[PDB]
Protein backbone atom coordinates (compact mmCIF):
# COMPACT_ATOMS: atom_id res chain seq x y z
CA UNK A 1 0.00 0.00 0.00
CA UNK A 2 3.05 2.28 -0.05
CA UNK A 3 4.72 1.63 -3.39
CA UNK A 4 1.86 1.13 -5.88
CA UNK A 5 1.56 3.63 -8.76
CA UNK A 6 -0.93 6.33 -7.77
CA UNK A 7 -2.55 8.71 -10.25
CA UNK A 8 -2.01 12.22 -8.83
CA UNK A 9 -3.62 15.21 -10.55
CA UNK A 10 -3.52 18.92 -9.72
CA UNK A 11 -6.43 21.29 -10.43
CA UNK A 12 -5.18 24.85 -9.97
CA UNK A 13 -7.14 28.05 -10.56
CA UNK A 14 -6.28 31.24 -12.43
CA UNK A 15 -7.02 34.65 -10.87
CA UNK A 16 -6.46 37.68 -13.11
CA UNK A 17 -8.32 40.64 -14.63
CA UNK A 18 -10.63 38.46 -16.71
CA UNK A 19 -14.36 37.47 -16.45
CA UNK A 20 -15.33 33.94 -15.27
CA UNK A 21 -14.23 32.08 -18.45
CA UNK A 22 -14.60 28.62 -16.77
CA UNK A 23 -16.40 27.95 -13.42
CA UNK A 24 -19.42 26.19 -11.82
CA UNK A 25 -22.76 27.36 -13.31
CA UNK A 26 -24.74 29.78 -11.07
CA UNK A 27 -28.18 28.46 -9.95
CA UNK A 28 -30.93 29.83 -12.27
CA UNK A 29 -32.74 32.60 -10.30
CA UNK A 30 -36.31 33.84 -10.81
CA UNK A 31 -37.31 35.91 -13.83
CA UNK A 32 -38.92 39.32 -13.27
CA UNK A 33 -40.31 41.56 -16.02
CA UNK A 34 -41.62 45.13 -16.28
CA UNK A 35 -39.56 46.11 -13.22
CA UNK A 36 -36.41 48.24 -13.02
CA UNK A 37 -33.95 45.38 -12.52
CA UNK A 38 -30.21 45.01 -13.11
CA UNK A 39 -28.97 42.19 -15.34
CA UNK A 40 -25.66 40.93 -16.75
CA UNK A 41 -26.36 39.06 -19.99
CA UNK A 42 -22.84 38.15 -21.10
CA UNK A 43 -21.84 41.58 -22.42
CA UNK A 44 -22.99 44.36 -20.10
CA UNK A 45 -24.22 45.15 -16.59
CA UNK A 46 -27.31 47.16 -17.55
CA UNK A 47 -30.22 48.35 -15.42
CA UNK A 48 -33.70 48.61 -16.89
CA UNK A 49 -37.07 47.03 -17.49
CA UNK B 1 -38.50 71.67 -47.77
CA UNK B 2 -34.91 72.55 -46.95
CA UNK B 3 -35.24 75.26 -44.30
CA UNK B 4 -37.44 73.03 -42.12
CA UNK B 5 -35.37 69.86 -42.63
CA UNK B 6 -31.82 71.05 -41.88
CA UNK B 7 -32.75 72.34 -38.41
CA UNK B 8 -33.91 68.81 -37.51
CA UNK B 9 -31.20 66.84 -39.34
CA UNK B 10 -28.35 68.84 -37.78
CA UNK B 11 -29.80 68.37 -34.28
CA UNK B 12 -30.29 64.63 -34.84
CA UNK B 13 -26.73 64.27 -36.16
CA UNK B 14 -25.35 66.22 -33.18
CA UNK B 15 -27.23 63.97 -30.74
CA UNK B 16 -26.01 60.90 -32.63
CA UNK B 17 -22.43 62.16 -32.32
CA UNK B 18 -22.97 62.77 -28.60
CA UNK B 19 -23.83 59.07 -28.47
CA UNK B 20 -20.73 58.27 -30.56
CA UNK B 21 -18.42 60.25 -28.25
CA UNK B 22 -18.87 57.76 -25.40
CA UNK B 23 -17.66 54.97 -27.72
CA UNK B 24 -14.15 56.48 -27.87
CA UNK B 25 -11.37 55.94 -25.34
CA UNK B 26 -9.91 59.50 -25.37
CA UNK B 27 -6.46 57.94 -25.07
CA UNK B 28 -7.43 55.45 -22.35
CA UNK B 29 -7.42 51.64 -22.34
CA UNK B 30 -11.23 51.27 -22.35
CA UNK B 31 -14.35 53.19 -23.34
CA UNK B 32 -16.81 52.33 -20.56
CA UNK B 33 -15.78 53.53 -17.10
CA UNK B 34 -16.99 50.31 -15.45
CA UNK B 35 -14.42 48.07 -17.17
CA UNK B 36 -11.35 49.91 -15.85
CA UNK B 37 -12.90 49.99 -12.37
CA UNK B 38 -13.62 46.25 -12.46
CA UNK B 39 -10.20 45.32 -13.87
CA UNK B 40 -8.00 47.89 -12.08
CA UNK B 41 -8.09 49.29 -8.56
CA UNK B 42 -9.30 52.93 -8.29
CA UNK B 43 -5.95 54.23 -6.91
CA UNK B 44 -4.14 53.38 -10.15
CA UNK B 45 -7.08 53.95 -12.52
CA UNK B 46 -7.45 57.63 -11.58
CA UNK B 47 -5.53 58.78 -14.68
CA UNK B 48 -7.79 56.87 -17.08
CA UNK B 49 -11.01 58.07 -15.44
CA UNK B 50 -9.61 61.62 -15.33
DSSP one-letter code for A28: P
- Resolution in Å equals 6.3
Contact B39 A17 (CB under 8 A): yes
Q: What is the dihedral of CA B18, B24, B26, B28, to 10 degrees?
A: 140
Angle at A35 (CA atoms; ends A30, A40), nearest 5 degrees: 60
The shortest C-alpha distance from A13 to chain B (Å) reads: 18
Please answer whether residues B36 and B45 qualify as being in contact, where contact means their C-beta atoms are separated by less than 8 angstroms.
yes
Helix (H, G, I), strand (E, B) or coil at B43: coil
DSSP one-letter code for A6: P
* DSSP string for residues in B12-38: HHHHHHHHHHTTS-TTSS-SSHHHHHH
Please answer whether residues A17 and B6 qualify as being in contact, where contact means their C-beta atoms are separated by less than 8 angstroms.
no
CA nearest neighbour of B47 among B21, B23, B25: B25
CB-neighbour burial class of residue A13 (10 A; exposed 0-12, middle 13-18, buried 19+): exposed
Amino acid sequence: VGYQPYRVVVLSFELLHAPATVCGPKKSTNLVKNKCVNFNFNGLTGTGV
Amino acid sequence: LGKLQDVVNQNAQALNTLVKQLSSNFGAISSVLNDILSRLDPPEAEVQID
